[PDB]
Structure formats: structure tokens, C-alpha cells
């Protein structure tokens, strides 16, 4: 919606039913102490961590946990979440006040977005995961084979 | 006086399409080096983590990260995981060698068990989620209102 949201949604590849759901995920507490992303981030943290270990398990030509922890630490790293975030230019949609966006914050909004997509889609974890793979399964896969 | 190998499906309310997927989850290295639950439990960690957290987020009274976290470390602890497995008599079904099973293998088999369901199901996160909740949604909410840890 609005003169902005519609554009994040086309990059996202998903249009929301509840627009304020999307907005809450992009909004820093500095902007609204009443409706900001902290709780969605909490959810999206577990959600995304799940999406990525799934790809990790599914792929990865080595299956011992001893191999899986390292790339995993990377794939959930703030550095890698910023990488995927860049594919949506998320810095551009975040709602913030007295202060500037960060990698960390971009990292937390990213988890928040996915939690609201999950929820907005009626808590549809299979669709959400696929949305996620459409967008990022390519990088995640290139990552695993030692992609800087 | 029957149903030794399993009974566990009727507990879960789910019949596996591939039995060796359920077998794999309940199998520890000491019994089978070929297929033990190691990789599933890795998945299962992340799987059950999200089931619990999703519940936590909608049902806890305080939606602040401050209050959610200490509850969350409880609800995904081996201790509590065990209390969830006791409802499955999971120990009963584990294919483990020697005499020491322990509390770490069990919550781990608990973890690898909901990952095997996930996968057997054709990766249906939603169905697996509800299947999970039908069995423990009860105890998770409860534990939220008492608030431990
Ligand atoms: Mn975060
Ligand atoms: Mn574990």
C-alpha cells in the first residue's frame, strides 16, 4: 500500500492483506513505541533460522553436524542477512527516528518482515518458506560451496 | 502384550510413509553408524524451536523480548523436552546400545522425531506444526502462565 509499501511488496513478491502488519515489521521503536518490530523479530528469528537449516539439511554434500554448524553460523550471521536484505533494498523502507539505520537493525527488520509475511499469510509456513526460497535459495546455495 | 517395535505412530497420530525415516530418528550411533538420528535432530532443533516460539509470541502476556527470552530458554530445554517425550514413552522406542541412554539423547530423539515427521510429510511445516500442537499445545501454554526460568 501507500506511496512506498507497494514497491517493497513487488520486490518481496508478496502483497499483504493487513498493511499495518508489514509496517510494524519495518518500524523501529524510536518511531512507534506502541507498534514496532521487536515482537515480530522475535518470531522471524526462529522462522528464518528454520528456513535456512532446512535448505542446509536438504543440501550440503556433508551431513555431519560438525560440518553443519559452521556454514550455519555464517548463514544466520548478521553479515549474510544483510546480503539477502540488499535484494530488497530494505534500508529504504525502514521507519526510524532520531538516529540512523544499521546492519544490525536491517538484520532485525529482515527477521521481522518474514514473521509478518508468515502471519499475514495466515501463519502459512510452507508458502512463506517457498517465498523465501524463490528469493534467496540461489544465494544460500552458492554460499554453502564456499562463497566468500 | 503387543506392539513392541512401535505404538509411537498412534501416539503421534501420524503414520509414516517411510518407516526407516522414523527408524532413523529413534536410532543412536551406538546402535547404527549407517543411519542414526544425528542429521534429523539438527533439523528438528530448528523445527521445534519455531513451533514453540510461534506459540510463545501469540500466547504470552508480555510481548517484549525481555520477558519472552527467559521463558523461551525453558520451553526449548532438554528438561522440558523430556516432559514432552514422556508423553510418548520415547525411551521405549529408542534403538540404543549398552546401558546409558540418558537425558540428552532423549530430548535429542525428541528433536529428531519431529523432524522425521516433517520430512515424511513431504515437508509440510503447517501439518507438522498442528500435529505438534495437538499433543503439547496444552503443556506449553500452561508453562507460560506459571512462567519458569
Ligand atoms: Mn534479531
Ligand atoms: Mn538437541
UniProtKB/Swiss-Prot annotation, chain B:
Shown residues within the full chain: 1 to 147 of 221
Name of this protein: Ribonuclease 3
Effect of residue 111 to K: Loss of magnesium, alters ds-RNA binding, loss of activity
Taxonomy of the source species: Bacteria, Pseudomonadati, Aquificota, Aquificia, Aquificales
Physiological role: Digests double-stranded RNA. Involved in the processing of primary rRNA transcript to yield the immediate precursors to the large and small rRNAs (23S and 16S). Also processes some mRNAs, and tRNAs when they are encoded in the rRNA operon. Probably processes pre-crRNA and tracrRNA of type II CRISPR loci if present in the organism.
Keywords: Cytoplasm, Endonuclease, Hydrolase, Magnesium, Metal-binding, mRNA processing, Nuclease, RNA-binding, rRNA processing, tRNA processing
Record EC number: 3.1.26.3
Active site positions: 45, 111
Reactions that this protein is recorded to catalyse: Endonucleolytic cleavage to 5'-phosphomonoester
Entry's family note: Belongs to the ribonuclease III family.
Source organism of the structure: Aquifex aeolicus (strain VF5)
Entry's Gene Ontology BP terms: mRNA processing; regulation of gene expression; RNA processing; rRNA processing; tRNA processing
Free-text cofactor note: Binds 2 Mg(2+) per subunit. Mn(2+) also supports catalytic activity.
Listed GO CC annotations: cytosol
Amino acid at each position: 500500500g501507500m506511496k512506498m509499501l507497494e514497491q517493497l511488496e513487488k520486490k518481496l513478491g508478496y502483497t499483504f492483506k493487513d498493511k499495518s502488519l508489514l509496517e510494524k515489521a519495518l518500524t523501529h521503536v524510536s518511531y512507534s513505541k506502541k507498534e514496532h518490530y521487536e515482537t515480530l523479530e522475535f518470531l522471524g528469528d526462529a522462522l528464518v533460522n528454520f528456513f535456512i537449516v532446512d535448505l542446509l539439511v536438504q543440501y550440503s554434500p556433508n551431513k555431519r553436524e560438525g560440518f553443519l554448524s559452521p556454514l550455519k553460523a555464517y548463514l544466520i550471521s548478521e553479515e549474510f542477512f544483510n546480503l539477502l536484505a540488499q535484494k530488497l533494498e530494505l534500508h529504504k523502507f525502514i521507519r526510524i527516528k532520531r538516529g540512523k539505520i544499521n546492519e544490525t537493525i536491517i538484520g532485525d527488520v529482515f527477521e521481522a518482515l518474514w514473521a509478518a509475511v508468515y502471519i499475514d499469510s495466515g501463519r502459512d509456513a510452507n508458502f512463506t518458506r517457498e517465498l523465501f526460497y524463490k528469493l534467496f535459495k540461489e544465494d544460500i546455495l552458492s554460499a554453502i560451496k564456499e562463497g566468500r
